[PDB]
């Protein structure tokens, strides 16, 4: 009934609110995508384009919520780049053990950080794992978490090591399914990391629109922005 271009006009305000709160680079990407939806000849184009807005915007608010840097996909570091710059003395071995699984070197998580020392820096990795584990324990939110560990080694108090934090996030209906497949994907490289004596933590989580607005991995004020924009776009897309 409603043409799609007309559908975008109606939600001009909610989408304006959305672009204004997103980080700068995330905002512009969502603004290009929005015009692709307005100028969409087919309802499959519009849908696929709206799927990208749902994920990209959500990531922008995940960055804001956690005070991490939003990284456009084009500029996201892979694992190989992380090992090379952060652990340069192990990269050659990191290349040898990936001879049979070369896709590992090209794994690109949503966030690839390291403890303060294009890998982003964070002051404490253990605190990020705790905050994830806390909310999982408190609101029943499904996560998966893994830590590399050479042999059965103990943590130590007389020296500091470099370490990575690998985080995957998502906005999609099958929350359980997302974290299981994410952790299955990274399990191989965790084991590789144990064998190279590199400390990594892998975290994965997801939200969906049925998640109570106080319980998401993003601030509730951002939950409201997504529900009032990207979620009404999807509902109006199907009906008309």
């Amino acid at each position, epitope marked *: 009934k409603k043409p799609i271009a007309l559908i975008c006009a109606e939600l001009y305000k909610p989408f304006q609110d959305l672009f204004a709160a997103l980080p700068k680079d995330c905002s512009e990407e969502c603004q290009t995508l929005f015009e692709d939806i307005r100028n969409s000849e087919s309802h499959a184009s519009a849908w696929s384009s709206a799927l990208r807005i749902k994920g990209v915007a959500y990531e922008g608010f995940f960055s804001l919520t956690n005070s991490w840097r939003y990284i456009p996909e084009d500029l996201k570091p892979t694992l190989g780049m992380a090992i090379q710059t952060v652990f340069p003395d192990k990269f050659e071995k990191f290349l040898e053990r990936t001879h049979l699984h070369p896709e590992y070197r090209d794994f690109t998580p949503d966030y690839l950080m390291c403890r303060s020392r294009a890998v982003q820096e964070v002051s404490s990795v253990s605190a990020v794992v*705790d905050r994830f584990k806390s909310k999982s324990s408190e609101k029943g939110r499904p996560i998966r978490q893994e830590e590399s560990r050479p*042999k059965t*080694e*103990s943590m*130590q*108090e*007389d*020296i500091e*090591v470099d370490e990575l934090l690998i985080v995957e996030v998502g906005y999609q209906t099958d929350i359980e399914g997302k974290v299981i497949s994410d952790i299955e994907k990274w399990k191989g490289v965790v084991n590789l990391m144990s064998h190279l004596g590199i400390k990594v933590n892998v975290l994965t989580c997801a939200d969906n629109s049925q998640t109570p607005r106080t319980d998401w991995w993003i601030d509730e004020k951002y939950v409201r922005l997504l529900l009032n924009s990207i979620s009404y776009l999807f509902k109006e897309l199907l009906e008309n």
Partner: antibody
Amino acid sequence: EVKLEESGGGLVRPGGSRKLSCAASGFTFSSYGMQWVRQAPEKGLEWVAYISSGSRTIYYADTVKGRFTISRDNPKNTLFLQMTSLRSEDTAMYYCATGYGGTWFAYWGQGTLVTVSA
Amino acid sequence: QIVLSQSPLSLPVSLGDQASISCRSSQSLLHSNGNTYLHWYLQKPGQSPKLLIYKVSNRFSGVPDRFSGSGSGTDFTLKISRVEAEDLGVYFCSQSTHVPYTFGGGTKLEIKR
């Protein structure tokens, strides 16, 4: 001077429970991991449990897992060991210890004796 | 578990003589951070244990310099260069590279007479 001072020992029936405490002084307790070690009479030393400075990392000897809980209270410079489901094989001198900079046992208390028997 | 094997079980030694105690590990104690967490303790009769040497060869502050440690990987040695009467007691090695932390079974230093 660094000093560690255990208390809470005594006699426990098998299956019983008992909490030990270790009061620490002479160093900034909250910055260091703390440990429990025990020694059955006329036997060698046996590591029990470790707890990191901020309690985030805890390790247990396999023979106490699921029965013993280690914890600390940093504002009160006190280390705890909660023992439950005690067995006569848990009879031992219990020592708290710290590396004061590492995971080795640099500083030791005088120990407290726990006897598990009916 | 890491198994630590001390030899000899007992060591009779004359005052003034050197003593050597061996601790072997069932796997390497080199930690991935580059350190090697093998340590030596002395327990005098009726006392709690005291640290002598931490990470293979670092003498603990205040320990007499007759005590030294050496080795690497799975093979480590405590040496007493010149035994004194107060050195009577049980010597233990222990490792904290892997969990569980484990002790050797002890060497009893006996004074010859």
